[PDB]
Chain length 77, copies 2
Amino acid sequence: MELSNELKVERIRLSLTAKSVAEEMGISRQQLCNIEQSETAPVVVKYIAFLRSKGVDLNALFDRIIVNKLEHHHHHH
Amino acid sequence: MELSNELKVERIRLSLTAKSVAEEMGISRQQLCNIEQSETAPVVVKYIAFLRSKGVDLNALFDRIIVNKLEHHHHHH
């Protein structure tokens, strides 16, 4: 299925604009084109899947990086 | 809790060795050290996070790559 081929399909389905992505991403538009043509993803992405495969809260990890971090829900766990 | 700081927490929390991870990952131990010395997250990962922000089933995409193509779907959407 090729990862690059699936990336374009989702982009087309969401018909998103690189203008908004580059402004929000904070990178040059030319680099955005290179990300999809970046041949393959770095071992970093595979490394994350390894920890995720162990049930590691990957979503919570990325949630903390993006602003609007979760506050106190008053619930222990 | 920076990108490398949390990366150390999951490794320490699950206590994973470089040799065990490198053999399971299928990469050289030197490549694993490169990830630890990596600088912040790459634009490739940030671009992918953008697709997830759109509600894209990113997890299902990787699940499809691993193990035979699992689908057995014949029910209504």
